[PDB]
Design a protein around this ligand. Structure first.
Ligand SMILES: CO[C@@H]1O[C@H](CO)[C@@H](O[C@H]2O[C@H](CO)[C@@H](O)[C@H](O)[C@@H]2O)[C@H](O)[C@@H]1O
Ligand SMILES: CO[C@@H]1O[C@H](CO)[C@@H](O[C@H]2O[C@H](CO)[C@@H](O)[C@H](O)[C@@H]2O)[C@H](O)[C@@H]1O
Ligand SMILES: CO[C@@H]1O[C@H](CO)[C@@H](O[C@H]2O[C@H](CO)[C@@H](O)[C@H](O)[C@@H]2O)[C@H](O)[C@@H]1O
Ligand SMILES: CO[C@@H]1O[C@H](CO)[C@@H](O[C@H]2O[C@H](CO)[C@@H](O)[C@H](O)[C@@H]2O)[C@H](O)[C@@H]1O
Ligand SMILES: [Ca+2]
Ligand SMILES: [Ca+2]
Ligand SMILES: [Ca+2]
Ligand SMILES: [Ca+2]
Ligand SMILES: [Mn+2]
Ligand SMILES: [Mn+2]
Ligand SMILES: [Mn+2]
Ligand SMILES: [Mn+2]
Lengths: 234, 234, 234, 234
């Protein structure tokens, strides 16, 4: 299967599969069943910001999600990504809807990865605007870009209305050398701003930043609770 | 054919096709026949640094090549890249040998592109070492990656000996959005360090940083004076 | 006197001292009488962006001023700043009013300087929010920081009204090493966003990004057309 | 007393004040007695690199010291620096010798701090070469810069021999806004490369990256095991 590291903003509690019984942020290591979660109040129709930091030296993947009012949720998990991820990866953003839905709108996305010995390899990109033809993104499933300048990870019905059983992802075009055996520091950070909007009984399913094998594809049947990330709930 | 913008470090005077009659640096705009050149003393077997700066506001593409002893060559050309390049490009390094040869070894290469506004998209990468399997580079022709942690643009022997009739290029994997009609600033810079070494009667043929259409390939017969860049000498 | 290189956003035509007869951006080198100007449509009450670029290869001091409707004015002047500026400087923002007035509100300011090779010294600061007690800015004359996250270079009344005969500057706290003899490029850039509002159909006097000796202070009487920069209009 | 957060590269075990009985990197929070240490193989006369990372999400102050053969030592300590540091600080490098001595030579220092909320205030500096009159560094005690491009924190004799009972520090000229209550992520990193050379039975006393109140000065008698940081060994 693919190998997945993800920070999910999980708007829908699937308690059947380990979710806590609230919207949450969580850190996913090779499983949709988060290794750590924090209660998250998603603010409907508001623009949130997710910051994801992996500290290669502290061996700690950390995330915060916040909204302009001050409200933030924070999660940290101690992990050495050297033992999890392959050396080369693609990075991206994933969202899904299932029986319930929400807009999974990305308004900006940056990423910085650095491999240090004494000499550094580094990759930084920032999207503050997405083109209708955003050639440096691989769009997968239902994901689209433009002309409002946003990345729509799942189907949105152009009057702005979220569609259910949708799954979409965007990966940065270039593979990322995310760790190296000889790298003293293999750190990365990612930032994205998003607009989740739902009028549903409950919003579902969430957005994730993720790191995958290079050839990673949306697994068959990963709408809903699987966030476009996983083939199953294991 | 391809659309090419390049800064050449041309180790070989092809005075039959417009070269000045000395090793030179030059700024190539859709032709191997540089728009501006400066005399350049290539220092055999020394590590040189090339800095390329495109100032989108100043509409000036500038280049310096220097060596540790301070000796530098500078060229600037006034040009609006909006009128030359397609919106989406690949950026890369090119080198060739012909009837004469030299090593065209790249030891480092960084690039930063930024589009403002009204906000900023950016791409920055830096390579200080090149891996055997450098997945974020499209290698073309004879170009191979390290060790000695180096990018060899043209054929060299494992024991350091350059080959004639060689052409190779390395392009960053991701397409770059190099300008956009609504960009207030569409600037970029590139830097690379290189080791050109020859025991030939004359070193040839040079190294270029270039920017091409996304699908750019080595044009047939662009070994030698063309310097993996152009289909002919027009 | 101080030594001043400035990029002026001059709102008030002082035709008796060589201003053209329209609001303009200009490049000032040791004189308030710009070496080069471009006509500028100041958009009253709109948030403008100024971007300022110089490197020691092209030696072209460029500035663009743009508003989010996409109107922009650009000005460039080739000038060798090695020959103009002290090696070490402070960098700053300055603004002034005289008989006529405007708010000279800075909403953000960023600056980068670099000296490469053989390696890099760099200074980069970004202020997107100014703090009430901004310990890394030297505020001079009427300049004040909020709350409201803004820098008001010149005095604004309680009722929102800009006051005349005001001058103020903010300089970054650290000296900046603007050129170094062994450097093979020296580059700087600066960007700032600003909000000039006038209810006089006579906004005055304007805002400058400036570079000066480290001990630079507001020349006496440099309110109004002298922009907080010059002791006289020579 | 100053408030000190520091990462120490402690060459000399002062077991009577809680050092482990080996050279060590440690995390110091308001005491010379490190909250956490790791055993460190100081490679006499090799250029080492220290990397220090903290962010306010993960709140893990991590540091690694490595040498080009790939030997590294890492230490991390979870600590909420909001509760330790003043909001504004100066950042610096400190070193000392006592009865025993070592060159405490700094070959490079880079620092970045950022305060993000909605998408950022930032300070970044890098010194790869120290200038004889480095106007953006505040040198304290025995510390001296240039003409060799290095910063010698402690006294080195004309014949190359390091002197005992020496303390010197370099702080960056500007105050750094290390935390802000409205920031959702405050982060800093620091990298420095160093060359510790002893010809004796033993090297002492070590080098620290430190963060302090803006008016921080060398405490009296803080040569030796106090590393220029602390007034006592409490
Ligand atoms: C076992 O019963 C299930 O009930 C839920 C909804 O109540 C439904 O889950 C689907 O929709 C949610 C919300 O989008 C997703 O999280 C799930 O993955 C799934 O698609 C089941 O289908 C059943 O009715
Ligand atoms: C007609 O004579 C030409 O002679 C030159 C060199 O003697 C040769 O040029 C080749 O080699 C150079 C140097 O490497 C390249 O720049 C050229 O493109 C070419 O490959 C010509 O082929 C002719 O013989
Ligand atoms: C000529 O006498 C004055 O009238 C002028 C206006 O022409 C005024 O100049 C002041 O105001 C302008 C606009 O703000 C500035 O550019 C000048 O420097 C100055 O402050 C004089 O002060 C007198 O009123
Ligand atoms: C016990 O008397 C002293 O001997 C110690 C060392 O054992 C010496 O300490 C000095 O040197 C060490 C090593 O440099 C430092 O860590 C100390 O702080 C101090 O400078 C004393 O000075 C006496 O010689
Ligand atoms: Ca869920
Ligand atoms: Ca040639
Ligand atoms: Ca004027
Ligand atoms: Ca000690
Ligand atoms: Mn979950
Ligand atoms: Mn040529
Ligand atoms: Mn003017
Ligand atoms: Mn210790």
């Amino acid at each position: 299967a693919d190998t997945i590291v993800a920070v999910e903003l999980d708007t829908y509690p699937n308690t059947d599969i380990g979710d806590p019984s609230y919207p949450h942020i969580g850190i996913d290591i090779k499983s949709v069943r988060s290794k750590k979660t924090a209660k998250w109040n998603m603010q409907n129709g508001k623009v949130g910001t997710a910051h994801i930091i992996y500290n290669s030296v502290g061996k700690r993947l950390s995330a915060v999600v916040s909204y302009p009012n001050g409200d933030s949720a924070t999660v940290s998990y101690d992990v050495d990504l050297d033992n999890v991820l392959p050396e080369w990866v693609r990075v991206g953003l994933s969202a899904s809807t299932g029986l319930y839905k929400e807009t999974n709108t990305i308004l900006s996305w940056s990423f910085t990865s650095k491999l240090k010995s004494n000499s550094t390899n580094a990759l930084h990109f920032v999207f503050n605007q997405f083109s209708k033809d955003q050639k440096d993104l691989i769009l997968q499933g239902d994901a689209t870009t433009g002309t409002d300048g946003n990345l729509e990870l799942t189907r949105v019905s152009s009057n702005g209305s979220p569609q259910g059983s949708s799954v979409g992802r965007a990966l940065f075009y270039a593979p990322v050398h995310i760790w190296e055996s000889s790298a003293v520091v293999a750190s990365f950070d990612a930032t994205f701003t998003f607009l989740i909007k739902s009028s549903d009984s409950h919003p579902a399913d969430g957005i994730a930043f993720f790191i995958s094998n290079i050839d990673s594809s949306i697994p068959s049947g990963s709408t809903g609770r699987l966030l476009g990330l996983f083939p199953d709930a294991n």
